[PDB]
């Protein structure tokens, strides 16, 4: 239900110009198309998009860090800026990390998890495009990814789910998990 109430609020061009939100969660990932599809499924030139949730809380969609998702000449700088945002954004209470289920935990995915890990805040992973895998492959990939992330449990509660925008699969768990973060924070 939490994401169904989201309303687009404002777009900002530079992290330097972020508004002072009460509380926010961030969506990050390699692929703009996969991340946009997930957000569209959850809510029914890429820039920084703020969506208003209930009670003055916010979700922030940040430009993807994969090839071509921002111009290649500035992508290294963007990775550093986004990494610094994860490390330092004081009102960021949780991270939604979107990764293609066929190719999870690429180097930049892990770098973003490392940038965020010192916060001790929770991460929820959507293994997107789950419909591209057989059901047995989906189950195996989910367990493999969870096992690979166990070292982050020294500081963080990491949760992982399969997600499909095409099949509308996984909406309830995403709402439940992110909802619990704001309930805890409020």
Q: Which residues are annotated as a binding site for Mg(2+)?
A: 36, 45
Kindly indicate which of the ranges 39-47, 59-67, 110-118, 176-184 contains the residues binding Cl ion, using the contact rule CB under 5 A. Answer: 110-118
> Distance (Å, rounded) from C-alpha 91 to C-alpha 22?
7
**Interface size with a copy of itself, residues (CB under 8 A):** 24
Which C-beta is closer to ligand GDP: that of 36 or that of 141?
36
Q: Is 131 in the site for ligand GDP (CB under 6 A)?
A: yes
Q: Please, are residues 147 and 114 in contact by the beta-carbon 8 Å criterion?
A: no
Q: Is 33 in the site for a copy of itself (CB under 8 A)?
A: no
- Among a copy of itself, Cl ion, ligand GDP, none, what binds residue 185 when CB lies within 5 to 8 Å by partner kind? none
Question: Which residues lie closer than 8 Å to 103 by C-beta, 6 or more apart?
Answer: none
> Distance (Å, rounded) from C-alpha 112 to C-alpha 122?
13
- Residues in the site for a copy of itself, rule: CB under 8 A? 80-81, 83-84, 87-88, 105-107, 110-111, 114-115, 118-120, 144, 147-148, 150-151, 153-155
């Amino acid at each position: 239900n939490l994401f169904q109430n989201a309303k687009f609020f404002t777009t900002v061009n530079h992290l330097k110009d972020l508004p002072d939100t009460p509380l926010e969660i961030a969506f990050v990932g390699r692929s703009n198309a996969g991340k946009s599809s997930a957000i569209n499924t959850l809510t029914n030139t890429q820039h920084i998009n703020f969506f208003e949730l209930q009670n003055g809380n916010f979700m922030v969609d940040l430009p993807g860090y994969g090839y071509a998702q921002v111009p290649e000449a500035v992508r290294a700088h963007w990775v550093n800026l986004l990494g610094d945002y994860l490390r330092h954004r004081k009102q960021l209470i949780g991270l939604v990390l979107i990764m293609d289920a066929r190719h999870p935990l690429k180097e930049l995915d892990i770098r973003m998890l490392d940038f965020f890990h010192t916060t001790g805040r929770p991460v929820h992973i959507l293994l997107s495009k789950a419909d591209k895998l057989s059901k047995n492959e989906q189950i195996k990939t989910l367990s493999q990814v969870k096992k690979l992330l166990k070292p982050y449990s020294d500081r963080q509660n990491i949760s992982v789910q399969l997600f499909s925008s095409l099949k509308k699969q996984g909406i309830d768990e995403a709402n439940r998990t992110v909802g619990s973060w704001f309930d805890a924070a409020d």
